[PDB]
Amino acid sequence: RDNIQGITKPAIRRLARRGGVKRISGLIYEETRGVLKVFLENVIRDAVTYTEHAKRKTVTAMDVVYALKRQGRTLYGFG
């Protein structure tokens, strides 16, 4: 299955503007999408295992916060 390219180019243009930079080379988008893949995969592994040890085949919503907290980040505003 292949759906990686959905995150468009002006979107990361807007994020770069958020960051505070004005000049961007045209060969920067591929590795930004690679970084996004890596971050997403690491977060979703822990999320899915956190749900798997419920003795329930299901998934919850606090588990994303759990995974983010254990990864090193932490999110305020969701339970």
Binding site: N3, A11, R17, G19, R23, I28, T58
Partner: protein, 95 residues
């Protein structure tokens, strides 16, 4: 209109004021289910979790860009290139 560099600061100031998320949900979710399928598939999720994910990721990305910008300024240029992202991720301690 024309004159790149000025409208760049226009949008930079708008976006430093704005507070909106900018990523899509369905490729997000198909990646979620496929990278679970790599480990275990058909897991029964929630609905407001997605938003959460997006929020974190966006913060991540924007923060990262800041560091890369500094690296570019360290090389006496303005344009940021794929080299600076790798430098910033290596010296950060996440390789």
């Amino acid at each position: 209109r024309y004159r790149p560099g000025t409208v760049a600061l226009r949008e930079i100031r708008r976006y430093q004021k704005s507070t909106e998320l900018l990523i899509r949900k369905l490729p997000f979710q198909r990646l979620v289910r496929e990278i679970a399928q790599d480990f275990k598939t058909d897991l029964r999720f929630q609905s407001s979790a997605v938003l959460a994910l997006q929020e974190a990721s966006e913060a991540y990305l924007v923060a990262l860009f800041e560091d890369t910008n500094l690296c570019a300024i360290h090389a006496k240029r303005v344009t940021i290139l794929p080299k600076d992202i790798q430098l910033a991720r290596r010296i950060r301690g996440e390789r």
